[PDB]
């Protein structure tokens, strides 16, 4: 399938061309909303932890895919294996704001914490990269604190980014990167 190339209009090609047929693919899995809903366990750095995302390992699935689309929106579903009582506090709310039991001060059970989390930014949308290590103080989905937090996971929800970014991986060396799969 020839064409003009310095025009970059999408100009694909497919099987049929020289022969063969083309199939009915079921990409359900490469569905952006689908493969971003599944918790990421980031290090709950002490107790006073901010519900940021660029804290997460930029190498995990929900992390990586995260770092590939500039803009985005979604909600939150957390997890907190921990000690004491998780007293979350909204966005913008004073660091200190997170302490009063009246605030959503969850009461421990066994063993972590599964709760829902609205996306509460004053901006109509958020991003992993603000051209404005150096990204905005309104870029936080609330903020938690208990009295010792051991497990921090963020199941992003109702996902939906916008615009794209670069996707690369494991620089091999033999034109074919070798790594033991699952064998009998």
């Amino acid at each position: 399938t020839t064409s003009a190339g310095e025009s970059a209009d999408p100009v694909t090609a497919t099987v049929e061309n020289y022969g063969g047929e083309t199939q009915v693919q079921r990409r359900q899995h490469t569905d952006v909303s689908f493969i971003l809903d599944r918790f990421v366990k980031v290090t709950p750095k002490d107790q006073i932890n901010v519900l940021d995302l660029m804290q997460t390992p930029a190498h995990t699935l929900v992390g990586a895919l995260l770092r590939t689309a500039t803009y985005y929106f979604a909600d939150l579903e957390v997890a907190v294996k921990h000690e004491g009582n998780l007293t979350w506090v909204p966005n913008g709310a004073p660091e200190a704001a997170l302490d009063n039991t009246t605030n959503p001060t969850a009461y421990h059970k066994a063993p972590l914490t599964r709760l829902a989390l609205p996306y509460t930014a004053p901006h109509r949308v958020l991003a992993t990269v603000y051209n404005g290590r150096a990204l905005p103080t309104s870029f936080n989905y609330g903020a938690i604190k208990a009295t010792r937090v051991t497990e921090l996971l963020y199941r992003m929800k109702r996902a939906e980014t916008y615009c794209p970014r670069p996707l690369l991986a494991i620089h091999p060396d033999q034109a074919r990167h070798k790594q033991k799969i699952v064998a009998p």
């Binding site: 399938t1 999408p10 694909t12 909303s33 829902a116 996306y119 996902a159």
Partner: protein, 46 residues
């Protein structure tokens, strides 16, 4: 939205699970994907 195969209204009301997306007044990437010709700039033979 990922993995929500609950048969119920996930109990807790609508205006409760997630935060409601107020309106105003692949979206586009699918728009520039579903338009790539597999034609030929000459004329097939044989």
């Amino acid at each position: 939205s990922g993995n929500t195969g609950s048969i119920i209204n996930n109990y807790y009301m609508q205006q409760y699970q997630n935060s409601m997306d107020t309106q105003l007044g692949n979206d586009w990437f699918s728009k520039l994907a579903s338009s790539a010709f597999s034609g030929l700039f000459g004329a097939l033979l044989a």
